[PDB]
Amino acid sequence: TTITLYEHDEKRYRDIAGDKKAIQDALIKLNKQFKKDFKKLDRSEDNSDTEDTIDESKGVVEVYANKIKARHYVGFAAVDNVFLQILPKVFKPKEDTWEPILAFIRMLDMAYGLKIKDHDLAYLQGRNLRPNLYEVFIYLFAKSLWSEVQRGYHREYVEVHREEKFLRGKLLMSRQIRKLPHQLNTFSVEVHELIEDNLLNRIFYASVREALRRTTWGLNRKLLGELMLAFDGITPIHLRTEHFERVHFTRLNERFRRPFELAKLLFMEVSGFFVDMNKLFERFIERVLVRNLPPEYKLFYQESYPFSSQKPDYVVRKGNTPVVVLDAKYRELKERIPSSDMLRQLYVYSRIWPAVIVIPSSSTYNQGLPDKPLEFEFFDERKLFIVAYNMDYVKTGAIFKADKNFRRSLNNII
């Protein structure tokens, strides 16, 4: 069964496909698996409460008696033929669930640091496939591999001190001089032969073999079927985490960086990955600000310690003199005013940095939308200047029209 969630959204167990007992068995393994692998991913003002909440089967999904509720952890996971995918709530609409997939991967393209191509994703737009995050990241792995295997096969050179019936390469002399004449019929050479089954090819044969076994499309089954035939002579391996560390990216296999990072993102039971929606917006806004703020340079994660260090998500300073704090919040900001938890942190970030502070918030049809300019000016009775900026999201499309509107509102703010 395929189940899909948006951030802070619920599904009924009666309407859902499959079995009632089957889905709740899949989740308790996933929330437990998120507990052991929680510390690998960074957060930003998450209020995670690592001791109590995550180990109570509330790590990724809150499984309840009457419904199934998603926390603010975005991504996907495939467990026990119950494929779960959690999209952001910002891309929620009012092919009907194919626009938020390419919106989320493009927000996973710019924020998280991936180097995927837009024409890789635009190939899938309109082919009426079943929307699934695991079916597209296997495709993004398989297409970027088959576009990097079609040119060259990555045959890397190792040297072997082999006793050959012929003579290839440099003849070892200290091993041939001390050769008895009863065994003179084989040369003892040290040939730098190119092997096809290197460590990077043992991984990509194993990463395809664990992908074709767990794929469900008709496009990925054809593409991984051609990749497995190209890797036919390679002896297979069992994938571990030691194999993904033992290879290093030099200049002669640098073009295999794009399929390998996606092969490390999906393989290392469980499959997939999860990230916090607060930090992914904190990373995504950081791409927008430094591009859109020419007058003043901006650094993310600068920290100033009170008295326990409370650090802004981003601060922009021209040289050192202007202190314009920019704290990225994923909150909906209901009733056109910041909440108690938000404005209390905005007060501290301005005071310990005469410092204006701007809060960027999400804006679409689903999320709360303010007017086009800088919506809310606030003073906290200390000559402060709190500006509520809102970035519109044309990221569901491929054109960046809202970046010009975000620059025009920031130019009036700067």
Binding site: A22, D80, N81, V149, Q150, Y153, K165, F166, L167, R168, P181, L184, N185, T186, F187, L212, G218, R221, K222, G225, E226, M228, L229, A230, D232, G233
Partner: protein, 392 residues
């Protein structure tokens, strides 16, 4: 319609110089290449005018052109004389056999005929005549460089070389000196005559315009990720399609009677009439079965993974069709789809069927995470024919 396939090879082999009969296995690519050379140069065996040679994964350049090899010398201790491979024993042979018919006033025809004897010698070279072989080979490449390009295009004996399974070996490593030479222009006598200096023996070497290197590439193994520049431009690729037109009643009768004898063709007529009467009196059954199963292969997987037509070409009864479907089609079908079951039953259009007359029946015990494993099921008699009559 096989003389056009002996003309499709023949029109490309005088224009590009060498071909590759690429196609799915069980088609006749080895048989078309072998029965074209035997029909052209009337020599039923290898050796003199053509040499059959297959490739493998551990085949190296030193076995093909030349390499240092230990060789015994008159039942005594070994020496380390450099041995010419299987190509250089026929590339030099195609030169010195063509240089008989050339009437020039500089040919050492007594010396060239002595070199031709030492090249066709089936025994290995003894050191009393190996130095006579290397000295006469030195006279050959002093003579070839002195002949003009006008007298090195019309060499009469067409030498051949059936490279079987050319994609199985590493093609760019075997053809070391033969991905700069195997063009029609880079041969001897052409406009771009190149005599390439070899690394091991140190003597210059150039392919003559007689040698045509026919290749028979299986493409269900070590697929189309080829060299794509060197081993793809030189070879004029001929697709040998798996033709189900040879699987009718008359076409199976015509194939198995021409190679047959007097008493064999009457028994092959009685056997094939018994076979197709058990199938439903369908004279076009095995054609329609192979054509239907080939369309399902080219839709799901690649178009060059189709089941060929050399398998069903040697059937005479239902029991022989059973032993070619369960040992040369269904193990071959489970090889292409990498032990998949939900798409291997759509090829037989048995996607929504289980436990009946199906070639892959579902086991009635699912796994822990809801997975299911199918199992091959042997059939017999009219149950198997009813399992074949719903593939169409």
């Amino acid at each position: 319609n096989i003389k056009e396939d002996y003309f499709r090879v023949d029109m490309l082999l005088n224009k590009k110089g060498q071909v590759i009969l690429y196609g799915p296995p069980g088609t006749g690519k080895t048989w078309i290449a072998r029965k074209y050379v035997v029909e052209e140069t009337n020599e039923k065996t290898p050796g003199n005018k053509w040499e059959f040679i297959t490739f493998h994964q551990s085949y190296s350049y030193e076995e093909f052109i030349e390499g240092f090899r230990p060789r015994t010398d008159n039942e005594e201790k070994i020496r380390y004389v450099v041995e010419d491979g299987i190509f250089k024993k026929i590339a030099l042979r195609a030169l010195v056999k063509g240089l008989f018919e050339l009437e020039d006033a500089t040919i050492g025809k007594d010396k060239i005929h002595r070199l031709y004897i030492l090249l066709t010698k089936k025994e290995p070279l003894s050191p009393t005549e190996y130095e006579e072989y290397l000295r006469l080979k030195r006279y050959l490449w002093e003579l070839v460089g002195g002949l003009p390009k006008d007298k090195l295009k019309n060499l009469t004996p067409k030498f051949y070389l059936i490279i079987d399974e050319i994609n199985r070996g590493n093609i760019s490593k075997i053809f070391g000196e033969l991905i700069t030479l195997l063009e029609k222009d880079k041969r001897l006598g052409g406009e771009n005559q190149l005599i390439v200096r070899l690394p091991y023996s140190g003597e210059p070497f150039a392919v003559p315009p007689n040698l045509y290197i026919i290749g028979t590439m299986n493409t269900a193994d070590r697929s189309i990720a080829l060299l794509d520049v060197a081993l793809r431009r030189r070879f004029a690729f001929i697709e040998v399609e798996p033709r189900p037109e040879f699987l009718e009643k008359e076409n199976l009768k015509k194939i198995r009677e021409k190679k047959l004898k007097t008493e064999d063709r009457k028994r092959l007529n009685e056997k094939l009439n018994e076979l197709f009467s058990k199938l439903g009196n369908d004279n076009y059954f095995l054609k329609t079965l192979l054509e239907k199963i080939n369309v399902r292969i080219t839709v799901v997987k690649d178009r060059d993974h189709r089941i060929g037509h050399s398998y069903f070409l040697n059937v005479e009864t239902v029991e022989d069709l059973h032993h070619v479907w369960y040992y040369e089609v269904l193990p071959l079908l489970m090889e292409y789809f990498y032990n998949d079951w939900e798409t291997i039953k759509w090829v037989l259009n048995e996607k929504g069927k289980e436990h009946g007359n199906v070639f892959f029946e579902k086991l009635r015990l699912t796994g822990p995470n809801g997975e299911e494993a199918y199992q091959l099921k042997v059939l017999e008699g009219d149950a198997f024919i009813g399992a074949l009559k719903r593939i169409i």
